[PDB]
Write an enzyme that holds these catalytic residues in place. Structure first.
Site, PDB file in Angstrom:
ATOM      1  N   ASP A 129      21.159  13.575  -1.417  1.00 40.82           N
ATOM      2  CA  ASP A 129      21.551  12.573  -2.406  1.00 40.82           C
ATOM      3  C   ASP A 129      21.234  13.133  -3.788  1.00 40.82           C
ATOM      4  OD1 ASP A 129      22.390  10.131  -3.544  1.00 40.82           O
ATOM      5  OD2 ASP A 129      20.387   9.277  -3.370  1.00 40.82           O
ATOM      6  N   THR A 171      21.452  11.877  -7.059  1.00 42.38           N
ATOM      7  CA  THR A 171      20.649  11.080  -7.975  1.00 42.38           C
ATOM      8  C   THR A 171      19.458  10.470  -7.249  1.00 42.38           C
ATOM      9  OG1 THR A 171      22.696  10.551  -9.152  1.00 42.38           O
ATOM     10  CG2 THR A 171      20.725   9.295  -9.725  1.00 42.38           C
ATOM     11  N   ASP A 178      17.102   8.412  -1.192  1.00 44.86           N
ATOM     12  CA  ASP A 178      16.106   7.433  -1.615  1.00 44.86           C
ATOM     13  C   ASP A 178      16.765   6.142  -2.075  1.00 44.86           C
ATOM     14  OD1 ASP A 178      17.249   8.452  -3.905  1.00 44.86           O
ATOM     15  OD2 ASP A 178      15.372   8.483  -5.045  1.00 44.86           O
ATOM     16  N   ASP A 232      22.479   5.562   0.705  1.00 44.69           N
ATOM     17  CA  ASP A 232      22.298   6.560   1.746  1.00 44.69           C
ATOM     18  C   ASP A 232      21.630   6.005   2.995  1.00 44.69           C
ATOM     19  OD1 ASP A 232      21.821   7.875  -1.136  1.00 44.69           O
ATOM     20  OD2 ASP A 232      22.870   9.329   0.126  1.00 44.69           O
ATOM     21  N   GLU A 281       0.111  38.346  39.216  1.00 45.10           N
ATOM     22  CA  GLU A 281      -0.784  38.015  40.326  1.00 45.10           C
ATOM     23  C   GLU A 281      -0.015  37.873  41.641  1.00 45.10           C
ATOM     24  OE1 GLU A 281      -3.720  35.043  39.171  1.00 45.10           O
ATOM     25  OE2 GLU A 281      -2.722  34.812  37.227  1.00 45.10           O
ATOM     26  N   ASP A 317      -5.773  31.630  31.987  1.00 46.10           N
ATOM     27  CA  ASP A 317      -4.811  30.586  31.668  1.00 46.10           C
ATOM     28  C   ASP A 317      -5.369  29.482  30.786  1.00 46.10           C
ATOM     29  OD1 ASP A 317      -3.337  32.091  33.430  1.00 46.10           O
ATOM     30  OD2 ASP A 317      -2.677  30.399  34.664  1.00 46.10           O
TER      31      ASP A 317
HETATM   32  F1  BEF Z   1      23.831   9.707  -5.746  1.00 41.91           F
HETATM   33 BE1  BEF Z   1      23.155   8.978  -4.581  1.00 41.91          BE
HETATM   34  F2  BEF Z   1      24.172   8.128  -3.757  1.00 41.91           F
HETATM   35  F3  BEF Z   1      22.092   8.000  -5.136  1.00 41.91           F
HETATM   36 CA   LIG Z   2      -2.037  28.931  36.477  1.00 40.83          CA
HETATM   37 CA   LIG Z   3      -2.960  33.887  34.973  1.00 40.21          CA
HETATM   38 MG   LIG Z   4      19.996   8.126  -5.045  1.00 38.41          MG
END
Ligand code: BEF
Ligand SMILES: [Ca+2]
Ligand SMILES: [Ca+2]
Ligand SMILES: [Mg+2]
Length: 1021
Positions: free
Chosen positions: A351, A353, A702, A706, A770, A799
């Site tokens: 976004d 702005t 923000d 969005d 093993e 292990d």
């Molecule tokens: F430019 Be954004 F949609 F705030």
């Molecule tokens: Ca094991």
């Molecule tokens: Ca092992």
């Molecule tokens: Mg914005």
């Protein structure tokens, strides 16, 4: 005190001393604070320590190991339980590894959660309020909000406490109450009282609930309940959760785990079938039952050793470290699946702005219409100094043609700015910077009108806090606002009808319009010059448009807006139908078409971060609701678009994007980095189009614009200083408001995946080693070199702690230069399986070779031919082949301890070179991972403890060693690291140096290989 939805506005205001349009007295504020209490909701913990340790144990691999421990305890029952050393050590060894993994996991996860909660208090909850200390709205901490206090809220703001709608300052108020009510669709609200004595939350349109978001509206209310007494606090006792943790990585790892468990079971069945067939030797083996139980214990121990039992623990610790690291860098991660898929992110939508820009908006330029002599118009073009939200900091540079601010047009512009906005400034004790209330543009105009444009009043020496309130109050008090016109995208402007308080001198009818320069320049047909009005001129409007475009020519990317006057409105609210056509029809002709210039600085830490994203292979797309020109200019400044580039087919608007050939549409969605002037629905459509190409999408924003699209994207990100609607709709919150955290999140996701792969590689290689050892010993007819307790001890030492500490690996060097992975490809490739098979084959061959070395060519052991070793069971003490060699030696505990030590050391060496997939220890010394080195040292200390005390070697069927045998163990265990380095080199070059480390390893290597007398071995068959 009492329910207020049924009660009307008059008495609920009269319930306390609260009054509309004013605040509450400080003494009664503190009185109600003492009585009712603070507006704080108790944050009870939902994960106790017991459940926290249990949640690790629940997995197929861990449950199988628990079952194996129970089976070992059951089979150990050959003598009374008073003896806890002879037969009660193998279940304890099985249990110790699980206990260690559980402790590590719980400690890491508790650290991560403790880090997260402290981060949520980095920015305390804020809410706008009306008080008697400051005449206009001021922001205060939401933790201190007494009931019965005026509280203003606007679009995209959380409701601090349950508020009843005293008045609505917008046409329609739409509030999202999904979290409480469960209604996804926004709910329109009115101020009419509730006619239901006990109304359901669905049908309660008179009050707003705490913790809810406003989708679109501006309103002012009275708080009725605070803290736990709120409708979100009483029901807070009830627990709500998703209980979903199956990330795609965890799902595919669980599939790998179940396939591996099936293969391990088949291998154990093979061990049983191939081995017991020839077992009739009289080592308590003349009875079928005893041999069967012994080989069942062997199979159980092999199954314990050959399954990765730290897998849930390593996954948990990787996630916990990622979350804790983001907590340190001031990023709240409310969804564990996000960070890992941030590793796989391929497109980052953003976004423009508010998120990419710094969101603090200030006036910088201003032009009025000077005396016009015809087609050409001279323009004053003033400049304003100051970017912070401060009236004191603005001095107008004292160099412009007017400093006394006596221009009549400037007076009119100041009046328009004061009376055409709904924002204010407030002074907080926290800083010296006055906070912004309302939209950034309106607040910047408010801090613009502070200077003595209208009147040369002497306000010097007055209250510091009164500046933000009395800067435009003088203009407001001399001209009374009547009503406003809603801002609609159809005309992209706002209008306010105002009647002056002036006693009928100026006809008592004014309209003030705040909009885009294009809309007003098209609508305005009558220009204002000086104190008079002149007919519309093409030259004047064209010069104004040229000046606007110049202001958009890379100086500050065209944040300017125009303010105009309509002197003769048709009538005072003759009709106000809520349609866009009437609003445009009400703006037929205007005057004073001059504009004002604004600056929105792009964030410093964005461009570099963008430069990182293209390095990682992640495309960055700017999708915004602003103009195409502004978006393209900001893209060029940030670096998404190269300077002087053909942006013909890479920048689009919503309208032109909607009307396209589907082939052209899908091509454009792939190759376009900028979409401008797009509604939320259009952003969601773009995001889903991107997702339809099997592409993982991350989006940040923000704003409410969005908010829907953040839901469609695989990853949703919201900045800390943004609208709470974006935060509720996002997965990660940037409290610090720093764009550099996104690339760090991608890095941490990639690092988590890489550490998971390293853990898988190490465990699979060692354990197949093993298993290959067991098969080789069985096939060649050699005496068995691994008894169940030894196999369980190997499983514990190789292990448990080192593999778990492998999860603290530092990030790879080339982590941020690789293309994002496709989550659909197989977890383990063909080359990785070959690497695991090669390493396991070497480990098994090395252990078998160490045993055969002790039997055949040993300094302190008997010399037995390979033929005798292969046929050791064929001992009758009189065999011509077996002359002079006691065949009780084939039961010696020296080959067994040789195999034990060789296996342990070779697996530690494999752990050492498992730091990186294709990076040598010369490039990546182990000193960067102190946890792994400490774990290796502790485990080798445990080995030396069980090997060099009195009682412990007896119970493990091993014997103490001397220097020469340890040197032989090191000599036969070292080449695994060289083989792994060769494999890494091949993978680096054909498939795709720390000198101190070399100077340390070389003398130790020559010390190990100083004396060699272990050649001349017999034939292998
Ligand atoms: F430019 Be954004 F949609 F705030
Ligand atoms: Ca094991
Ligand atoms: Ca092992
Ligand atoms: Mg914005």
């Amino acid at each position: 005190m009492e329910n207020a939805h049924t009660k009307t506005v008059e008495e609920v205001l009269g319930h306390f001393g609260v009054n509309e349009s004013t605040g509450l007295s400080l003494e009664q504020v503190k009185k109600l604070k003492e009585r009712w209490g603070s507006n704080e909701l108790p944050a009870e913990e939902g994960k106790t320590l017991l459940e926290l340790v249990i949640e690790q144990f629940e997995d197929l691999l861990v449950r199988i190991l628990l079952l194996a421990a129970c089976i070992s305890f059951v089979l150990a029952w050959f003598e009374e339980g008073e003896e806890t050393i002879t037969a009660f050590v193998e279940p304890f060894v099985i249990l110790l590894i699980l206990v260690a993994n559980a402790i590590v996991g719980v400690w890491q996860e508790r650290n991560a959660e403790n880090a997260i909660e402290a981060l949520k208090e980095y920015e305390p909850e804020m809410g706008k309020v009306y008080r008697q200390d400051r005449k206009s709205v001021q922001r205060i901490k939401a933790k201190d909000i007494v009931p019965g206090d005026i509280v203003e809220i606007a679009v995209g703001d959380k409701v601090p406490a349950d508020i009843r709608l005293t008045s609505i300052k917008s046409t329609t108020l739409r509030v999202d109450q999904s979290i409480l009510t469960g209604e996804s669709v926004s709910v329109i609200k009115h101020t009419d009282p509730v006619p239901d004595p006990r109304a359901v939350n669905q049908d309660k349109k008179n009050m707003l609930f705490s913790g809810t978001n406003i989708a679109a509206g501006k309103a002012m209310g009275v708080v009725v309940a605070t803290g736990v007494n709120t409708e979100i606090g009483k029901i807070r006792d009830e627990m709500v959760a998703t209980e979903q943790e199956r990330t795609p990585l965890q799902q595919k790892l669980d599939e790998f785990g179940e396939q591996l468990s099936k293969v391990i079971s088949l291998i154990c069945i093979a061990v049983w079938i191939i081995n017991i067939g020839h077992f009739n030797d009289p080592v308590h083996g003349g009875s079928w039952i005893r041999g069967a139980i012994y080989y069942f214990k062997i199979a159980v121990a092999l199954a314990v050793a050959a399954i990765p039992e730290g897998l849930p623990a390593v996954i948990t610790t990787c996630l916990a470290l990622g979350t804790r690291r983001m907590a340190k860098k001031n990023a709240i991660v409310r969804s564990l699946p996000s960070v890992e898929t941030l590793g796989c992110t391929s497109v980052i939508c953003s976004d423009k702005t508010g998120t990419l820009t710094t969101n603090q908006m200030s006036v910088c330029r201003m032009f009025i219409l000077d005396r016009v002599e015809g087609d050409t118009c001279s323009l004053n073009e003033f400049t304003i100094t100051g970017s912070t939200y401060a009236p004191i900091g603005e001095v107008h540079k004292d160099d412009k043609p007017v400093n006394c601010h006596q221009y009549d047009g400037l007076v009119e512009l100041a009046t328009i700015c004061a009376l055409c906005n709904d924002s204010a400034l407030d002074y907080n004790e926290a800083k010296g910077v006055y906070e912004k209330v309302g939209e950034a543009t309106e607040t910047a105009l408010t801090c613009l009108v502070e200077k003595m444009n209208v009147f040369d009043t002497e306000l010097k020496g007055l209250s510091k806090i009164e500046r933000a309130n009395a800067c435009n109050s003088v203009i407001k008090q001399l001209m009374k606002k009547e009503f406003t016109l809603e801002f609609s995208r159809d005309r992209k402007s706002m209008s306010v009808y105002c009647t002056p308080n002036k006693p009928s001198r100026t006809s008592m009818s004014k309209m003030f319009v705040k909009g885009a320069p294009e809309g007003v320049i098209d609508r305005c047909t009558h220009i204002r010059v000086g104190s008079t009005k002149v007919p519309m001129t093409s030259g004047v409007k064209q010069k104004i448009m040229s000046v606007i475009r110049e202001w958009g020519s890379g100086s500050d990317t065209l944040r300017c807006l125009a303010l105009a006057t309509h002197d003769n409105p048709l009538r005072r609210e003759e009709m106000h139908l809520e349609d866009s056509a009437n609003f445009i029809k009400y703006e037929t002709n205007l005057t004073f078409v001059g504009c004002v210039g604004m600056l929105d600085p792009p964030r410093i830490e964005v461009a570099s971060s963008v430069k990182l994203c293209r390095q990682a292979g992640i495309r960055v797309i700017m999708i915004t609701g602003d103009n195409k020109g502004t978006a393209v200019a900001i893209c060029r400044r940030i670096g998404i678009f190269g300077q002087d580039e053909d942006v013909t087919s890479k920048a689009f608007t919503g309208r032109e994007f909607d009307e396209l050939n589907p082939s052209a549409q899908r091509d454009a969605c792939l190759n376009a980095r900028c979409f401008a002037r797009v509604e939320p629905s259009h952003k969601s459509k773009i995001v889903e189009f991107l997702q339809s190409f099997d592409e993982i999408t991350a989006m940040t924003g923000d704003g409410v614009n969005d908010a829907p699209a953040l839901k469609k994207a695989e990853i949703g990100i919201a900045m800390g200083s943004g609208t709470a609607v974006a935060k509720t709709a996002s997965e990660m919150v940037l409290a610090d408001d720093n764009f550099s955290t996104i690339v760090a999140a991608v890095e941490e996701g990639r690092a988590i995946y890489n550490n998971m792969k390293q853990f898988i590689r190490y465990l699979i290689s060692s354990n197949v080693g093993e298993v290959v050892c067991i098969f080789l010993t069985a096939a060649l007819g050699f005496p068995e070199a691994l008894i169940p307790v030894q196999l369980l001890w190997v499983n514990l030492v190789t292990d448990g702690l080192p593999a778990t500490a492998l999860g603290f690996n530092p990030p790879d060097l080339d982590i941020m230069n690789k293309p994002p992975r496709n989550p659909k490809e197989p977890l383990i490739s063909g080359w990785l399986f070959f690497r695991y098979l090669a390493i396991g084959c070497y480990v098994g061959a090395a252990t078998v070779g160490a045993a055969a070395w002790w039997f055949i060519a040993a300094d302190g052991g008997p010399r037995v031919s390979f033929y005798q070793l292969s046929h050791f069971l064929q001992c009758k003490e009189d065999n011509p082949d077996f002359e002079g060699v006691d065949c009780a030696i084939f039961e010696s505990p020296y080959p067994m301890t040789m195999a034990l030590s060789v296996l342990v050391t070779i697996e530690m060496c494999n752990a050492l070179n498992s730091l990186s997939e294709n990076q040598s220890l010369l490039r990546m010394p182990p000193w960067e991972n102190i946890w792994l080195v400490g774990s290796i040292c502790l485990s080798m200390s445990l080995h030396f403890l069980i090997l060099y005390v009195e009682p412990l070697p007896l119970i493990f069927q091993i014997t103490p060693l001397n220097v020469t045998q340890w040197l032989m163990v090191l000599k036969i265990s070292l080449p695994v690291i060289l083989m792994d380095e060769t494999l890494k080199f091949v993978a680096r070059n054909y498939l795709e140096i720390s000198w101190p480390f070399v100077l340390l390893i070389m003398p130790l290597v020559i010390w190990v290989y100083s004396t060699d007398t272990n050649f001349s071995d017999m034939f292998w068959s």
